[PDB]
Every structure is written in C-alpha cells, then in structure tokens.
Amino acid sequence: SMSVKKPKRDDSKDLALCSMILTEMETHEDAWPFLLPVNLKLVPGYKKVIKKPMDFSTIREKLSSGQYPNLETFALDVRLVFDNCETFNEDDSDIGRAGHNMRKYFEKKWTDTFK
Numbered sequence: 001s002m003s004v005k006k007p008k009r010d011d012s013k014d015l016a017l018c019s020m021i022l023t024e025m026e027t028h029e030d031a032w033p034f035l036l037p038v039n040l041k042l043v044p045g046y047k048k049v050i051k052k053p054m055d056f057s058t059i060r061e062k063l064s065s066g067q068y069p070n071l072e073t074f075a076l077d078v079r080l081v082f083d084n085c086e087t088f089n090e091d092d093s094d095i096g097r098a099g100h101n102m103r104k105y106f107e108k109k110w111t112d113t114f115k
C-alpha cells in the first residue's frame with residue numbers, strides 16, 4: 001500500500017526478453033496459422049465470432065511501439081491468440097493441434113525465462 005512496497009524486481013530486460021520469446025514462437029514450424037491477422041473478409045464467421053483477434057505480427061507491432069505496460073499484458077495477448085484458436089478450430093484438426101503445441105511451447109519459454 002502507500003509507502004509499503006515489496007522489494008523491486010529488475011524489469012529492465014523484460015522488453016528485450018519478450019521480443020526474444022516472440023521471435024522463437026514466430027520461427028516455430030507450427031507458427032503459420034498465427035503469423036498474420038486472420039483475413040476477416042475471406043474467413044466466414046471469424047469477424048462475428050472472435051471478438052478480439054490477435055496474431056504474432058500484431059503483437060510485434062504493439063511490443064515495438066510501447067503498447068504493453070508490462071510483462072503480463074504481453075502474456076495475455078499471446079494467450080489470446082491460442083484462446084481464439086481453440087474457440088474457432090476443432091481440437092482434431094491441423095490448426096487445432098498447432099494451437100495446442102504453440103501454447104505449450106510458449107508457457108515453457110515463459111516459465112524458463114521469468115519464473
């Protein structure tokens with residue numbers, strides 16, 4: 001509370017580390033469904049069903065232009081990509097399995113980097 005603070009964690013490398021983790025996700029071979037925004041004009045249903053589209057290139061833009069106030073807001077956008085994937089795709093499909101793989105891949109990098 002006021003004048004009562006926990007020891008300060010050094011957060012000065014967070015931006016560069018998040019950028020590094022995003023790059024590792026983008027080079028994963030199962031990243032292809034997530035690299036660019038879904039085409040809202042060519043994919044029936046997606047615009048109406050998915051209230052908040054997110055993808056790796058949009059995350060890169062936000063990251064590089066200072067639009068994440070902290071670590072956690074970056075993580076939320078990354079998870080949003082995979083939650084959207086799960087909402088719109090059957091588990092038993094290539095894209096469905098891609099999403100599962102990428103989420104697990106991310107959460108490991110995340111844990112290994114910060115926790």
Ligand SMILES: O=C(O)c1cccc(C(=O)O)n1
Pocket residue numbers: 040041047
């Ligand atoms: O690209 C878009 O934003 C889009 C595409 C198809 C329909 C609509 C719409 O009717 O709102 N919007």
Ligand SMILES: O=C(O)c1cccc(C(=O)O)n1
Pocket residue numbers: 048
């Ligand atoms: O964007 C739309 O098509 C829209 C607007 C208002 C309500 C609803 C709805 O009830 O789904 N959908």
